Every structure is written in structure tokens, then in C-alpha cells.
Amino acid sequence: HWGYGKHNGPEHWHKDFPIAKGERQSPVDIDTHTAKYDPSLKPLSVSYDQATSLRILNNGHSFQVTFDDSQDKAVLKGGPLDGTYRLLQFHFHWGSLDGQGSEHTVDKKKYAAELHLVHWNTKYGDVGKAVQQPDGLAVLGIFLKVGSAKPGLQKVVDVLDSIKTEGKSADFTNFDPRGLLPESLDYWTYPGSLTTPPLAECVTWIVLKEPISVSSEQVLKFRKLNFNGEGEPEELMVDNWRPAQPLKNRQIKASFK
Ligand SMILES: NS(=O)(=O)c1ccc(NC(=O)NCCO)cc1
Numbered sequence: 361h362w363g364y365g366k367h368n369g370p371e372h373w374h375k376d377f378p379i380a381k382g383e384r385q386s387p388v389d390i391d392t393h394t395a396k397y398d399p400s401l402k403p404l405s406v407s408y409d410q411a412t413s414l415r416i417l418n419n420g421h422s423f424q425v426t427f428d429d430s431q432d433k434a435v436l437k438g439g440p441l442d443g444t445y446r447l448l449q450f451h452f453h454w455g456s457l458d459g460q461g462s463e464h465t466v467d468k469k470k471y472a473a474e475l476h477l478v479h480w481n482t483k484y485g486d487v488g489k490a491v492q493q494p495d496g497l498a499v500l501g502i503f504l505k506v507g508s509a510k511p512g513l514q515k516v517v518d519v520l521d522s523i524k525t526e527g528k529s530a531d532f533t534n535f536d537p538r539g540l541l542p543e544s545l546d547y548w549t550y551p552g553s554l555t556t557p558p559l560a561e562c563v564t565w566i567v568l569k570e571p572i573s574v575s576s577e578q579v580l581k582f583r584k585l586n587f588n589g590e591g592e593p594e595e596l597m598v599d600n601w602r603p604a605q606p607l608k609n610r611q612i613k614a615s616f617k
Pocket residue numbers: 361362363367368369372373374375376377557
């Protein structure tokens with residue numbers, strides 16, 4: 361199956377998922393000079409106070425923290441969105457070196473990693489239905505640069521040794537995702553896709569201008585995860601990012617000047 365290696369990586373995905381060459385694929389390069397300030401964009405509303413994290417999982421492509429999405433506990437609204445979107449999970453994409461790892465780029469600059477907080481539109485009832493709709497998901501993307509540690513990330517980093525290989529999971533309750541957010545909620549937004557198969561064109565992307573800083577020790581712990589399962593040849597889970605895709609007939613809008 362699909363992955364990030366030489367014979368199954370992003371350049372191969374279109375053979376099983378032909379929408380990979382579609383009209384609204386993600387990620388993209390955010391050319392900050394060409395993005396247009398849209399004063400009609402509302403501030404983003406992030407309501408995570410009642411979030412209920414449940415589990416952390418190595419899925420063979422990333423690690424994800426999953427939340428109770430059976431009620432409006434952690435929701436994203438406002439910004440470019442109409443209606444309410446429930447947080448389902450977050451995960452990361454990262455590199456083998458600090459100069460690569462993000463999926464979106466900013467003026468061609470790559471960050472060391474990118475956090476995706478994945479939300480689905482409650483009017484569609486469940487995430488599997490939402491992925492079939494052009495406005496089904498809203499993913500909040502946050503860049504990670506390497507410098508000072510992010511204290512709110514540490515609880516995540518410290519459990520990664522218990523989910524080293526594909527398929528491992530652990531209980532992961534009481535995690536507050538507000539500890540992962542930068543100060544500013546200024547954002548760029550554009551219509552796009554899932555960045556992993558099935559690459560469905562169902563995402564309103566909301567990418568924050570302000571990166572968070574994580575420490576070298578924190579990102580090193582990401583790089584000790586494995587793509588493989590136990591008993592299989594060890595392949596470090598690094599460079600699990602899709603490169604920027606053609607913007608085609610899309611404009612990126614900025615909530616800020
Ligand atoms: N989804 S995808 O990137 O188009 C893909 C799917 C299966 C493969 N299969 C494969 O590489 N099989 C060899 C097994 O050991 C490769 C690429």
C-alpha cells in the first residue's frame with residue numbers, strides 16, 4: 361500500500377487514488393504576496409475547553425490523538441466556515457531534518473513539521489459522510505519551527521515510546537489541545553483536499569500564519585517512531601509529508617493584512 365517511500369510515496373498515489381491529480385489538491389505553497397486580504401473573513405472561533413481526548417495511535421503514516429466527536433465538545437466555527445465543525449483528531453507531518461517536514465509551505469519555505477487539527481461539519485453527521493462533501497472538513501494547520509520547547513506538546517512526546525510501531529495505541533485522556541496553539545489566530549484559507557489517501561476534495565484549509573516553536577528534543581522523539589510494525593524491518597517514521605501541489609484555479613485568502 362501507499363506510503364512515503366521510493367516505490368509507494370506521493371508520486372505513486374495517483375495510481376490508486378486518481379483524484380491526486382485533481383483540481384483542489386493539498387497541500388499548496390502559500391505565496392504570501394499573492395494571497396489576498398479578505399476583510400469579509402471573520403475571526404476563527406476555536407472552542408476547545410470541553411475537549412475529551414481518548415487515545416493516541418500509530419497508524420503507520422503518522423501518530424494521531426483522537427477525541428470524542430459524539431457531541432459538540434471541541435468545535436471550530438467562524439473564519440471562512442458556515443456552521444460548526446467537531447474536532448475528531450490531530451496528527452503531525454514531519455521531516456528527517458529541521459528544514460523539511462511541513463506539507464504547506466510559505467513563500468516556498470518548509471517548516472520542520474505541521475500539526476493538523478481535523479474537524480468535520482456537523483450537518484453531515486459523521487466524518488465518513490463529511491469526507492464525501494466539498495465542505496465536509498475543516499483542517500486547522502499549524503507550522504512547527506525548532507527552537508524553544510512547546511510545554512503543551514510534552515505530554516504527547518512523552519508517550520510516543522509506547523506507540524513506536526504501526527498499530528500500537530494507548531489511552532490518552534485529559535489532553536488539552538489549546539496548549540498547541542500559537543498566540544495569533546491570523547490565517548490563510550483555501551479549498552483543498554486530504555493530504556493522505558483517499559485525497560478527497562473535502563477540506564476547507566485554515567493555515568495559521570504564526571508557527572509554534574518546539575525543541576530539538578521534542579521533534580527528535582517524533583523521528584524515533586516507526587512506519588513498520590513490530591517484527592518488520594525498522595524504517596523510521598520521518599518525511600511523512602506530501603509536497604506542495606498545483607494551485608490551479610484557486611485563490612488563497614488572508615484574514616490579515
Ligand atoms: N496507493 S499507491 O502509492 O498507488 C501503491 C499501492 C501499492 C503499492 N504496492 C507495493 O508497493 N507492493 C509491494 C509489496 O511488498 C505501491 C504503491
